[PDB]
Structures are given as structure tokens and as C-alpha cells.
Amino acid sequence: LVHVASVEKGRSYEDFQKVYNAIALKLREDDEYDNYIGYGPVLVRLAWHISGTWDKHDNTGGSYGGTYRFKKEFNDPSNAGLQNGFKFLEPIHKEFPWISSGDLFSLGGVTAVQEMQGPKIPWRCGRVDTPEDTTPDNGRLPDADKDAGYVRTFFQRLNMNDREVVALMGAHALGKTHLKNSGYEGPGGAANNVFTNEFYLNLLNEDWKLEKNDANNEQWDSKSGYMMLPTDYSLIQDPKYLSIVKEYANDQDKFFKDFSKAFEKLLENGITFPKDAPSPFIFKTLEEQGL
Numbered sequence: 001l002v003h004v005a006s007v008e009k010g011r012s013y014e015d016f017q018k019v020y021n022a023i024a025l026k027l028r029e030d031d032e033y034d035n036y037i038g039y040g041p042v043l044v045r046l047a048w049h050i051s052g053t054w055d056k057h058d059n060t061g062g063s064y065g066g067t068y069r070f071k072k073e074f075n076d077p078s079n080a081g082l083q084n085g086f087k088f089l090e091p092i093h094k095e096f097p098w099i100s101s102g103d104l105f106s107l108g109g110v111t112a113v114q115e116m117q118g119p120k121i122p123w124r125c126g127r128v129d130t131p132e133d134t135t136p137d138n139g140r141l142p143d144a145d146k147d148a149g150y151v152r153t154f155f156q157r158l159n160m161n162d163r164e165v166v167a168l169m170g171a172h173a174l175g176k177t178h179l180k181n182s183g184y185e186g187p188g189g190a191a192n193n194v195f196t197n198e199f200y201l202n203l204l205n206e207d208w209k210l211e212k213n214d215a216n217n218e219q220w221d222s223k224s225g226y227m228m229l230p231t232d233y234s235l236i237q238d239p240k241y242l243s244i245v246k247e248y249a250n251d252q253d254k255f256f257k258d259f260s261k262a263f264e265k266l267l268e269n270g271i272t273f274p275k276d277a278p279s280p281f282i283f284k285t286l287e288e289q290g291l
């Protein structure tokens, strides 16, 4: 199975910048969502979940086909809560019907990271919607109740190595767990709608207590009111992961650089870009445009 990127016919950088801008303007407007967190975090999670179904062995799943629009994937228990992100993007898709679903969902995540003062993430167009029978079965996204070995094995299916895994997980500074979605409750830190290296600082510096939550699942809770999933906490239990956590806690700029690469890689897994395709786009923030 090969998925060749095909640029939406007649579109160029400036067209996609307009879509970016619409997402960013709506992010600015809808600031009350989820007790004033806004939609940034859920859009990042959406972009990751539409990408994280990829299987490197047969090129099934991944962002290319936009298959989250189909009920089997939309209703995956692992995706509970992401419907909020999909509903946010609906008026954007109405305004720009020419964009593919996979391009829109992935672009929502790039837009969110940048508008939350995160790193620039280069982004490529050309994902093409595929039919309902190409939707991956449920069960391809990761469990939270597991250890470092599970995390490492899981992410190898996505061709992610240790540095990429640790960098990607820093997105857990954003937003929060919600008991009704996932059976976990609480934020990873204080700055949960501005992109920073707080996740790593908190892993290393907080006084964590293992507890059961109200859904009877184990999570690690701090005196400050923060939480870590067992899979988050595993990054300071495994010696290889711990070394990289310390690196990112000490150097936010290095984290930003590594996250940007890893996140682009995640969003592009499964896609073959013709050697003549446009170079990756780097979108201007609203602030950079005076908008």
C-alpha cells in the first residue's frame, strides 16, 4: 500500500496559510472551552490520534486518509473527547471545502502548537481522503496503564525512537485528563495552554504519590495538583528515557527543536512525498501577520 501525497489542485502556500489563520482566529475566539483552557490541547491530541493508528508493517492507518471522519474511528474509545476538536474544525472545513480531511486535522495540531507559543512545525499538504473501508480498527492507540517497555514497543510501530518518544510526550504539559473521557483526571502542570518544557520539569521536581482515582485507575499525583499517567511516569523509571527527560527539563529550546521534528514525522508517517512536491510550509502566526 503506497500513499502518494497529491497537492489539492491549484493550491499553494498562501491558500493553506488562510486555513491556518481561520483555525487560529477560532482558537482565539473560543477561549472559554474546558474551563478556559481553550481548544489548543484537544486539537494537538486530535492530530496525534489521527496519525497514531499507523502501522509501519503494512502502511494501514496514519493521517493520510482522513478516516477519523468515519464512525468506526470517531467512536474508538481511545478517541473519546476528540469529537470536541472535530466540531471545532467543522466551520473551518465549510469555509475551505477544498482541503482534505487529513490535511485539516493535521494542520489543526500544527496551528495549535504555534499559536500556543510553541516551535514552528513544518507541515506538508497532500493527504487524500480514502474510503470508509480503509478506516483502521480500534485498538491501535496506546494504553495508559503500562510501563516503559510497553511505551517503547508501542512507538516502534510508528518508527519512533527513544528521543522522539520522550519529545512527543512533552505535549502532556497541555490540557488535562478528564475522568469521563479516559478514566484519568487532572493537568500535568500550571501552564496548560502555553507550550513549554513544564512536563519534564514537573516529572523531575514534583513530589509524586501513586494513587487510585475515582475511576479506580492508578495515577501519580503531586501536592501541587498535577498528575502523570503510569506511561508518563515510566519516562523517569527507564534509565534511557530519564536521561532525555533531564535534557529537556534543562533546555527548552532543545525540547522545542526535537518536538518539532518528531511531531512532523508523526503527522507524515505513511506518506510518500514525490521528489517534486512543494517544500514543507512554515506558517506565520497571527501575531507575525498583524492579525
Ligand code: HEM
Pocket: 041, 042, 044, 045, 048, 080, 081, 142, 143, 144, 151, 168, 169, 171, 172, 174, 175, 176, 177, 178, 179, 181, 182, 183, 184, 229, 231, 263
Ligand atoms: C504512551 C502514549 C500516550 C498515552 C498513553 C496518552 C494518553 C492520554 C490520555 C489518557 C489523555 C487524556 C484524555 C482525556 O481524558 O481527555 C491524554 C491527553 C492528551 N494527550 Fe496523550 N497520550 C500519549 C501520547 C501523546 C502524544 C504522543 C501526544 C502528542 C504529541 C499527546 C497529546 C495529548 C494532549 C495534548 C492531551 C490533552 C487533551 C485535552 O486536554 O483535551 N499524547 N493522553
